[PDB]
Amino acid sequence: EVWVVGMGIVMSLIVLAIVFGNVLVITAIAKFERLQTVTNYFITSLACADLVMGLAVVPFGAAHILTKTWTFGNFWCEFWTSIDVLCVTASIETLCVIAVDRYFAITSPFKYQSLLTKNKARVIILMVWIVSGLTSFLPIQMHWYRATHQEAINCYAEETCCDFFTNQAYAIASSIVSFYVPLVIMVFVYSRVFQEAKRQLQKIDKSEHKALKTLGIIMGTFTLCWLPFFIVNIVHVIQDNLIRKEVYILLNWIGYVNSGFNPLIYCRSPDFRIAFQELL
């Protein structure tokens, strides 16, 4: 009753769902001119990142786990690691960009038009992707993330193994850039938005519960998917024998699933429902 035929089906289902949802979202945005909006360009960038992550990094990792060997060379292992880091950080930063856009829309409605236009959004997205690619491709391809202990060199020399060993400085300065700062920004933004919504409800009740569900769906999903992995990412370098490799791999694959839940969270507007109904 091997797991090769058991977990493989689950991995295939994950890949199919991730590809299909994001392809549908991108086609719906592109085909119909009624959905082209400044707030929809960030969703397009997020969907592109999720599509690349579901097409490139996931199948090769699944093959590596099931076959238990890395047939390809060292160059493709490095390329795969770089693409993985790039696609994770781009998505996690686009989420914070969306949150800040919503904050600026809600808080200052008179000047919202001037702050965000078609000119600024393109530059913002390009800057996000450039910063994403500056921390992923450059340090990995210039060999600055490597370690010093003997097992790291033994893994590096052999061309039939692809395992992730990292240095302390790279791990800390990568987690800080990729996860914690956007988390703080999103927390502050959504706290302000919730306060404004509560004030408006109080005003209406003075003149004459529904926001907690949306805030939870937006935030708890991201926190539960990505917070556990980065804690052990920080811990495992400091403590040599406090984290096993299997737990690290499992917590890493928990995070990949988060790319499939984005269409359900950010793309269930009635206009999007009409677009999906017309397409299929």
Ligand X SMILES: CN[C@@H]1CCc2c(ccc(O)c2O)[C@H]1O
Largest Cα–Cα separation, the chain: 74
Contacts of 95 (CB under 8 A, 6+ apart): 46, 182, 186, 222
Count of residues near ligand X by CB under 6 A: 10
223 binds ligand X (CB under 6 A): no
Of 107, 141, 175, 214, which lies in the binding site for ligand X, with binding defined by CB under 6 A? Answer: 175
- Least Cβ distance, residue 175 to ligand X (angstroms): 6
The answer to the question of whether 22 is labelled as a binding residue is no
Q: Which is nearer to ligand X, 38 or 243 (CB)?
A: 243
Interactions with ligand X, residue window 82-141 (CB under 6 A): 84-85, 88-89
164 binds ligand X (CB under 6 A): yes
Helix (H, G, I), strand (E, B) or coil at 264: helix
Of 252, 253, 274, 276, which lies in the binding site for ligand X, with binding defined by CB under 6 A? Answer: 252
Of 174, 258, 259, 262, which lies in the binding site for ligand X, with binding defined by CB under 6 A? Answer: 174
Closest C-alpha among 102, 13, 95 to residue 50: 95
Angle subtended at Cα 232 by Cα 177 and Cα 155, rounded to the nearest 5 degrees: 90
Interactions with ligand X, residue window 63-82 (CB under 6 A): 81
178 binds ligand X (CB under 6 A): yes
The answer to the question of whether 233 is labelled as a binding residue is yes
Residue 248, phi then psi, degrees to nearest 5: -60, -45
The answer to the question of whether 89 is labelled as a binding residue is yes
How far apart (Å, rounded) are the C-alpha atoms in residues 55 and 176? Answer: 27
Closest C-alpha among 18, 13, 40, 9 to residue 275: 40
How far apart (Å, rounded) are the C-alpha atoms in residues 89 and 226? Answer: 11
Which region, judged by CB under 6 A, interacts with ligand X, from 6-14, 17-25, 119-127, 171-179? 171-179
Instruction: Give the CA distances from residue 181 to residues 65, 74, 211, in Å, rounded to whole numbers and listed in that order.
Output: 32, 32, 24
- Least Cβ distance, residue 170 to ligand X (angstroms): 7
Per-residue DSSP letter, 196: H
Which region, judged by CB under 6 A, interacts with ligand X, from 117-125, 173-181, 182-190, 214-222? 173-181
Which region, judged by CB under 6 A, interacts with ligand X, from 124-132, 172-180, 209-217, 267-275? 172-180
Contacts of 43 (CB under 8 A, 6+ apart): 25, 29, 98, 266, 267
Instruction: Determine the straight-line distance between the first and last CA of the chain, rounded to whole angstroms.
Output: 38
- Helix/strand number for the chain, H first, E second: 13, 0
162 binds ligand X (CB under 6 A): no
Q: Which is nearer to ligand X, 256 or 272 (CB)?
A: 256
Q: Residues 141, 82: contact at Cβ < 8 Å?
A: yes
53 binds ligand X (CB under 6 A): no
Q: Which is nearer to ligand X, 22 or 136 (CB)?
A: 136
Q: Which is nearer to ligand X, 249 or 265 (CB)?
A: 249
Residues found near ligand X in the complex (CB under 6 A): 81, 84-85, 88-89, 164, 174-175, 178, 252
Residues that constitute the known binding site for (S)-timolol? 84, 89, 233, 252, 256
